[PDB]
């Protein structure tokens, strides 16, 4: 089997992407944030504290296929400080036509303020490795992990759009969705992430520096977070750019034409256009824009978030020894 689903930016900044997910019988369609940086499928629900709901909710008592996983609870927090917790059902979950029975659907009893505040996101679908799942006492498998037995190939692909719709595919590689060939690179699962080592970087039309950058492919992070020295090298090529303590990162004049940023995948090179790094104005009509490449020093890990991923066709190969592929597009 295969699935194919359209993913859409939630706003004009490409802050995040939502993808429809059908849960239960009859199907309840929720728009979830597919997150390769975590491993819980959790949803706003009829269980969620009413004052914390503003979203489409899952109602387990309206699904004939929902089963309570007795004694199971979950609790998660994320790098940006957001969090949620609750209890657990198994139910039928379909993404893009691909159906999994017995998927753990984590029903939120409570959600943090940032989730309440984002009317567009009805929950998360985690796509990192199942060792990160927060269900206790027994961790639950991701949608991808459960799907592998039926998939035509144990892969999914992320094709995120630049201010445009894109696609998540499960079980096949669409050879018309990218140019050139895919270059694959080793993944470490020791921390539960799609963790890999980039072979280096270049700024604009400058030289490629061979330097190992260990980081994660994270569709649930907006920006590209890289080592401080790498980020400083980038913004040195932007004449108005400065680090802003109050804004919390590099800012630059919105009118500037930015250089591209290239990262290495083995011998291959992925080029992030300058325009993608022009993230947006600090407020509507501001002359100051926030940069799309920022230091990873605060987060503590390098993160190839959407600014990087949307420049590529990205293959999450979930064979027993996983690998990560990138192609230009």
């Amino acid at each position: 089997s295969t699935g194919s689903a359209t993913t859409t930016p939630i706003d004009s900044l490409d802050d995040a992407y939502i993808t429809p997910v059908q849960i239960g019988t009859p199907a309840q369609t929720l728009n979830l944030d597919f997150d390769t940086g975590s491993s819980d499928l959790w949803v706003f629900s009829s269980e969620t504290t009413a004052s914390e709901v503003x979203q489409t909710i899952y109602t387990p008592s309206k699904s004939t296929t929902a089963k309570l996983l007795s004694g199971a609870t979950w609790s998660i927090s994320y790098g940006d400080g957001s969090s949620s917790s609750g209890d657990v059902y198994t139910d039928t979950v379909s993404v893009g036509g691909l159906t999994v029975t017995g998927q753990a659907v984590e029903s939120a009893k409570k959600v943090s303020s940032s989730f309440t505040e984002d009317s567009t996101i009805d929950g998360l679908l985690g796509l990192a490795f199942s060792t990160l799942n927060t269900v206790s006492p027994t961790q639950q498998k991701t949608f991808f992990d459960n799907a592998k037995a039926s998939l035509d190939s144990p892969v999914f692909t992320a094709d995120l759009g630049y201010h445009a719709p894109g696609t998540y595919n499960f079980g096949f590689i669409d050879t018309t969705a990218y140019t050139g060939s895919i270059t694959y690179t080793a993944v470490s699962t020791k921390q539960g992430f799609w963790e890999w080592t980039s072979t280096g970087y270049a700024v604009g039309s400058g030289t490629f520096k061979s330097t190992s950058i260990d980081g994660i492919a994270d569709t649930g992070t907006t920006l590209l977070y890289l080592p401080a020295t790498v980020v400083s090298a980038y913004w040195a090529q932007v004449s108005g750019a400065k680090s802003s303590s109050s804004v919390g990162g590099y800012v630059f004049p919105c009118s500037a034409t930015l250089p591209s940023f290239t990262f290495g995948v083995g011998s291959a090179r992925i080029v992030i256009p300058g325009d993608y790094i022009d993230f947006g104005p600090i407020s509507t009509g501001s002359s100051s824009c926030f940069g799309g490449i920022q230091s990873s020093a605060g987060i503590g890990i390098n993160i190839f978030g959407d600014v990087a991923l949307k420049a590529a066709f990205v293959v999450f190969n979930g064979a027993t020894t996983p690998t990560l592929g990138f192609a230009s597009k």
């Binding site: 706003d11 597919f34 994320y78 940006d80 998360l124 649930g220 987060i299």
Partner: peptide, 7 residues
């Protein structure tokens, strides 16, 4: 309004 998805 950037997002940073597990801690």
């Amino acid at each position: 309004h950037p997002f940073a998805x597990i801690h």
